[PDB]
Amino acid sequence: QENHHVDYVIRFNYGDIDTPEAIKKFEVLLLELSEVGLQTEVRQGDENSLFVFVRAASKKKLKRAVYQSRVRDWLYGVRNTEPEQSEAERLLVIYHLITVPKAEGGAGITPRHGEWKNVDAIFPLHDEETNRQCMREWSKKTFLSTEDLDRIRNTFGEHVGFYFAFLQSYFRFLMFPAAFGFSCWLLLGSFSIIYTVVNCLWCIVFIEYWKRQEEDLSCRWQTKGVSAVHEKRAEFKPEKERGVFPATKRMYRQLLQVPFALLAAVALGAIIATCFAIEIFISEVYKGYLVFIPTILVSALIPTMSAVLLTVATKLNDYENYETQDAYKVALTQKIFVVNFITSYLPIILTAFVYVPFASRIVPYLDVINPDRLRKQVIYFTVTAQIVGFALETDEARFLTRVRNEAELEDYDVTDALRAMCIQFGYLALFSPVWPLVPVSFLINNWVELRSDFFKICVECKRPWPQRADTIGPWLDSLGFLSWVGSITSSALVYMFSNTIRCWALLLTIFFSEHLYLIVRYAVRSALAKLEPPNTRRERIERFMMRKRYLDTVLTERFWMRQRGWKESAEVGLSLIT
Amino acid sequence: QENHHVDYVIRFNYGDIDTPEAIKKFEVLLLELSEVGLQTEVRQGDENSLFVFVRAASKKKLKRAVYQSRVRDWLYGVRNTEPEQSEAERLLVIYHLITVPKAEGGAGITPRHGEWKNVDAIFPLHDEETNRQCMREWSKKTFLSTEDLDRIRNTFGEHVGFYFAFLQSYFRFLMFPAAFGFSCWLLLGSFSIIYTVVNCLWCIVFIEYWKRQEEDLSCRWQTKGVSAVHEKRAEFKPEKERGVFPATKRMYRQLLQVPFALLAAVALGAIIATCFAIEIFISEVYKGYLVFIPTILVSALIPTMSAVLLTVATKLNDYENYETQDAYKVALTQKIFVVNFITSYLPIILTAFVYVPFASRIVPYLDVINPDRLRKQVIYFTVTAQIVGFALETDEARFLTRVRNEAELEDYDVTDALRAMCIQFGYLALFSPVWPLVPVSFLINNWVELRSDFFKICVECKRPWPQRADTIGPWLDSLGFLSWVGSITSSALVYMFSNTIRCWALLLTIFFSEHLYLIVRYAVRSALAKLEPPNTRRERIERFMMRKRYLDTVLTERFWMRQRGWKESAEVGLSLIT
């Protein structure tokens, strides 16, 4: 093939070790790779690092690897076939040959955690025929079929497959608010009740539909349940019998998220109040569109402030010392959600429920505010970042240098572009009745950046190892929390700013709209549970027939003496009736 | 033994058939019982009914029955051992031999549904040594050990076992509000905030603790997952390939619950308004405790009005034509919960939020109201029914007539005494801060009636066939809904009736108390998920070791030629570092 049958390539760096110490850690790595059935070949890489090439050493060793991985998947509950395939399947079982805890599988490699500090990251090689002769059919397509998502599952794994399927379903479901809000901008305007009810209905229906499509796609890609949690770079304090860490010592570090979030909220509310003060000063001392210059500056500085808070949250999450990857991911997603909620929505919350209604009590406290100010805030905080972001755009030595060019690329992260599609959903759920062209501005940006994720995953960063998944992650609970908060927030905004405040009716239409949201969400979930998707119905039919075939295969004392057999019992019965 | 090795006894009635028609249905029953390995013996019963006696016909047929039932339990997901025991286990596999759908198991008997109209109910025989030499150790005990619940699991099955464990845990958890409300009656009085917060905390903790004890007990009794749904007496319209019934035709009958519930609510609010009118008339035309006579009469007529609405709800649920038993049970529990919510709490809701605050606008509309009226209503609707209920109390022809006396008894129902323990929890969650002696009045009645369920299940009605369960049913969701409604209702009552109404603060302390309830419930659930019960930790340890033992048991082309083996690769590595 194009790649020289290479499954993986393992980069071992020696720029931080001695001359005689690196020759022992290299021999230990080669002996651990040769203890399992992996054939190794060493070549020179960069000026301080050499990489080895890992292949299946034989057909018998590869068959034993696939059988051991299928045994682990059947024992953990992923497989239900009691075992006795593709490119992603072979790459997954070879990555499980390299990187497991050595009690099963083998080779014990953890890339830069402990006792393997010299080796750098390991990675497979890019399928050139799949990211050249198929990447330029996916960018100029605008919509992907299920057989097209099968090609992004068979390469790059089910993790990338679920991420791209979620982006496709979100772009397909975004076409309804992008048409409806534009239809409710030429006809109804800002703060309309019809658009708010239909927008909250859409926010319910999209989440309850993707929750069904996830169970559809995890039964289609034969990955219906993944609870096989993996280890990490945990620093265990004791070693009592397995490394242990007390949860009471973890909660005392988990409580540090509260002062961090509170200080970030105060430090951003100070910037928002400063922007209000400079806007009032410019409105006093002169001016049409130039009076909202610091709001535009802080709305453009949002994505570089959230990154700083993201690095602080990553350091705080690494301090909390999690054991499993499926807990570190959940805690990181919770911290990213808190940071993005503080960063992206609280500038609009502080001008929707604090600044504009209590204008006469804070404007004299700032000088040393009609609802169009809130409309301009929702305009400036969902558009200008995307405007600025789209303004910065304006014999075998060939294979070895291709691999050396592939080792200098970045590493892909789903959790960076999936964070933005949560901020968009939070702007859609919470403050979208303020300006109904928020879905149009999101759909245009998504249609522009649709051909930017294929390019990124194909030519900009290296190929990820094929990771299995049954869901997009804990972002699907963040979407539900955003819809729940938006059902209160949009109803309060529509009451406060359509057409005194009558404070009993505001807290009545908060209560009734929240509980109507809960009732309608239960109804939509129970209605979508009834209708079964096809590729999880085929799996249920197959698992029913596989059980029915097996079941059809497998198929004092003188009182019980007066009626031998059953014909005598029938004779006693016929004598006893008459 | 005492019983003549009798597993089951099947009563066949002939009081409604002809003389020659009953001799064929009897022969069909005996042939269907003899097709499976069951030895039958016929004797005369009552003047229009004769019963047969069903035993395991051989050891090989009994072993085949246990193996087929274990195969069905392993295929449906109950068993995880891949098969190659007690009294309840033998009675369960013999009942599964008699009553299944004949595609598996055999004998096809459905007791009075279709093509078996002549046979009456079937039932096992009472273990006299277990309900005589052990029932008079359980009534005068007041508390049951786990080895004592094992005796009510090994007889009467896991359904009765979970019901008695729920009653024991509820009686043990009721001792804390029965002490705390009595401590908050000598010190604080009615409508106190401390008792309301602690009562809502107790309502959270009891439900989130029984949800953990259910997963404890279902892993202890080897019944951790039961999703093996059974058929029923469904009348299928078409027969397209299995009898089918469209859900769109079922929803049009399910919508009849709304006019039934609305008409019951209006018909009870009319009686409550009539009782208010007669109370105001007696208060005008004369009288200390006699002025609340119709309230006492309607509070005593509550349990005989809820029974009439229960029969209407049972007819409506049988009209809705459910296919599975695990859906008929859920819909019946929902209808019973709606009926009991209308019957037991809406008389207190109509005098807490309608009559007492708007007294000056309805008292002139009734004549042709201090919060002590609400306190007297909560007194009269949680006590006087229990007062009236506890005021109405003030050679082988011996075995055959014992069986004939056992066939005239009633049939046990868990869902009749488990309904009252939901009405008690609803009175505890919703209106208990009005009068803090509600938990004392419930604990005294529960301690009185604790020795009345053992008597009922042992000597008053016949022995149920051992039914398996993993939960008490869909009552555990009704308890959570009652706690959710009570977190709003008790906070509104404490704001309205402690020490103008200031209608913004009422709908503020509704909102904050409901969302504080949700936050604290999530915290209590996440804290109780951390702490693992012992008998589900032993099962997890066993399922981990059973997998670890099996896993330890089971364990272009010229580029891959320059380094044979791995020692040559280490030589190339040591040459390439230096």
B51 three-state secondary structure:
strand
B125 three-state secondary structure:
coil
Please give the DSSP secondary-structure letter assigned to residue B174: T
In angstroms, the separation between the Cα of residue A222 and the nearest Cα of chain B is 19
A91 half-sphere exposure, CB direction, 13 A CA radius? 26
Alpha-carbon distances of B368 from A66, B269, B271, B362, rounded to whole Å: 88, 19, 17, 12
- Chain A's closest residue to B488, CA to CA, is A511
CB contact under 8 A, B42 and A5: no
B433 half-sphere exposure, CB direction, 13 A CA radius? 28
Give the DSSP H or E segment for B396.
none
Return the structure tokens found at B528.
């109780």
In angstroms, the separation between the Cα of residue A411 and the nearest Cα of chain B is 26
- Interface mutation vs chain B, best among A9, A36, A41, A496, most B CBs within 10 Å: A41
Return the structure tokens found at B333.
């529990």
Return the structure tokens found at B484.
């959710």
Cα A85 to its chain centre, rounded Å, is: 27
Interfacial A residues in 327-366 facing B (CB < 8 Å): none
Residue found under tokens 């082309």: B557
What CA–CA distance (Å, rounded) separates A33 from A12?
13
Out of A41, A552, A572, name the one closest to residue B560 (CB).
Answer: A41
What CA–CA distance (Å, rounded) separates A464 from A406?
12
- Interface mutation vs chain A, best among B3, B40, B54, B250, most A CBs within 10 Å: B40
Using a CB–CB cutoff of 8 Å, tell me whether B28 touches chain A: no
Return the structure tokens found at B504.
């913004």
- Chain A's closest residue to B484, CA to CA, is A515
Using a CB–CB cutoff of 8 Å, tell me whether B101 touches chain A: no
What CA–CA distance (Å, rounded) separates A335 from A313?
6
Please give the DSSP secondary-structure letter assigned to residue A393: -
Q: What is the DSSP string of B202-227?
A: HHHHHHHHHHHHHHHHHHHTT-----
Burial (Cβ within 10 Å: 0-12, 13-18, ≥19) of residue A360: exposed
Which residues does B516 contact at the CB level (< 8 Å), separation at least 6? none
Using a CB–CB cutoff of 8 Å, tell me whether B388 touches chain A: no
B41 half-sphere exposure, CB direction, 13 A CA radius? 20
Question: Which among B122, B92, B124, B125 has a CA at the least distance from the CA of B32?
Answer: B122
Out of B247, B511, B550, name the one closest to residue A507 (CB).
Answer: B511
Residue found under tokens 């032993």: B538
In angstroms, the separation between the Cα of residue A38 and the nearest Cα of chain B is 10
Please give the DSSP secondary-structure letter assigned to residue A9: E
CB contact under 8 A, B30 and A551: no
What CA–CA distance (Å, rounded) separates B27 from A569?
9
Using a CB–CB cutoff of 8 Å, tell me whether B231 touches chain A: no
Q: In degrees rounded to 5, what are phi and psi of residue B222?
A: 60, 35
Q: What are the beta bridge partners of residue B53?
A: B9, B41
Return the structure tokens found at A525.
């979930």
Cα B560 to its chain centre, rounded Å, is: 68
CB contact under 8 A, B30 and A566: yes
Return the structure tokens found at A296.
């535009």
CB contact under 8 A, B22 and A247: no
What CA–CA distance (Å, rounded) separates A202 from A176?
8
What CA–CA distance (Å, rounded) separates A18 from A20?
6
- Interface mutation vs chain A, best among B7, B80, B395, B559, most A CBs within 10 Å: B559
Identify how the structure was determined.
cryo-EM
Question: Which among B294, B395, B280 has a CA at the least distance from the CA of B347?
Answer: B294
Out of A30, A44, A573, name the one closest to residue B576 (CB).
Answer: A44
Which residues does A88 contact at the CB level (< 8 Å), separation at least 6? A153, A154, A155, A156, A157, A158, A466
The interaxial angle of helices B302-319 and B293-300, nearest 10 deg, is: 40
- Chain B's closest residue to A506, CA to CA, is B504
In angstroms, the separation between the Cα of residue A546 and the nearest Cα of chain B is 9
Q: What angle do CA B282, B284, B286 make, to 5 degrees?
A: 60
Please give the DSSP secondary-structure letter assigned to residue A565: T
Burial (Cβ within 10 Å: 0-12, 13-18, ≥19) of residue A315: exposed
Return the structure tokens found at B111.
């007791």
Q: What is the DSSP string of A332-356?
A: HHHHHHHHHHHHHTHHHHHIIIIIT
Question: Which among B383, B385, B377 has a CA at the least distance from the CA of B303?
Answer: B385
Residues of A within 8 A of B76 (CB-CB) are 547
Out of B5, B104, B510, name the one closest to residue A551 (CB).
Answer: B104
What CA–CA distance (Å, rounded) separates B400 from A54?
80
Residues of A within 8 A of B14 (CB-CB) are 577
Residues of B within 8 A of A547 (CB-CB) are 75-76
Using a CB–CB cutoff of 8 Å, tell me whether B572 touches chain A: yes
CB contact under 8 A, B26 and A577: yes
Return the structure tokens found at A481.
């929390």
What CA–CA distance (Å, rounded) separates B4 from B6?
5
- A&B contacts, CB < 8 Å: 152
In angstroms, the separation between the Cα of residue A75 and the nearest Cα of chain B is 6
What CA–CA distance (Å, rounded) separates A30 from A52?
9
Out of A396, A554, A556, name the one closest to residue B71 (CB).
Answer: A554
Residues of B within 8 A of A39 (CB-CB) are 560
A131 half-sphere exposure, CB direction, 13 A CA radius? 18
- Interface mutation vs chain A, best among B3, B7, B36, B42, most A CBs within 10 Å: B42
A416 with A340: CB under 8 angstroms? no
What CA–CA distance (Å, rounded) separates B230 from B226?
11
**CB B512: neighbour CB atoms within 10 A?**
11
- Interface mutation vs chain B, best among A532, A566, A578, most B CBs within 10 Å: A566
What CA–CA distance (Å, rounded) separates A437 from A182?
6
What CA–CA distance (Å, rounded) separates A286 from B328?
74
Using a CB–CB cutoff of 8 Å, tell me whether A285 touches chain B: no
- Interface mutation vs chain A, best among B555, B564, B568, B575, most A CBs within 10 Å: B555
Using a CB–CB cutoff of 8 Å, tell me whether A401 touches chain B: no
- When computed from its CA atoms, the radius of gyration of chain B, rounded to whole angstroms, is 30
- Chain A's closest residue to B5, CA to CA, is A556
In angstroms, the separation between the Cα of residue A3 and the nearest Cα of chain B is 8
Question: Which among B100, B120, B105, B96 has a CA at the least distance from the CA of B7?
Answer: B96
What CA–CA distance (Å, rounded) separates A425 from A545?
42
Residues of A within 8 A of B42 (CB-CB) are 563, 569, 572-573, 576
Burial (Cβ within 10 Å: 0-12, 13-18, ≥19) of residue B135: middle
Q: What are the beta bridge partners of residue A44?
A: A50
Which residues does A421 contact at the CB level (< 8 Å), separation at least 6? A166, A167, A170
Q: After which residues is chain B broken (C to N over 2.5 A)?
A: 84, 241, 286, 368, 394, 499, 555
Burial (Cβ within 10 Å: 0-12, 13-18, ≥19) of residue A162: buried
Q: In degrees rounded to 5, what are phi and psi of residue B51?
A: -115, 150
Interfacial B residues in 512-541 facing A (CB < 8 Å): 530
In angstroms, the separation between the Cα of residue A371 and the nearest Cα of chain B is 23
What CA–CA distance (Å, rounded) separates A436 from A430?
12
Q: What are the beta bridge partners of residue A122?
A: A10
Please give the DSSP secondary-structure letter assigned to residue A1: -
Q: Which amino acid is at A132?
A: R
In angstroms, the separation between the Cα of residue A149 and the nearest Cα of chain B is 30
Return the structure tokens found at A520.
């309608």
Interfacial A residues in 237-266 facing B (CB < 8 Å): 247
Residues of A within 8 A of B23 (CB-CB) are 570, 573-574, 577
Return the structure tokens found at A394.
């304006």
CB contact under 8 A, B26 and A554: no
Residues of B within 8 A of A42 (CB-CB) are 563, 569, 572-573, 576
- Interface mutation vs chain B, best among A75, A484, A491, A530, most B CBs within 10 Å: A75
Interfacial A residues in 61-90 facing B (CB < 8 Å): 67-68, 71-72, 75-76
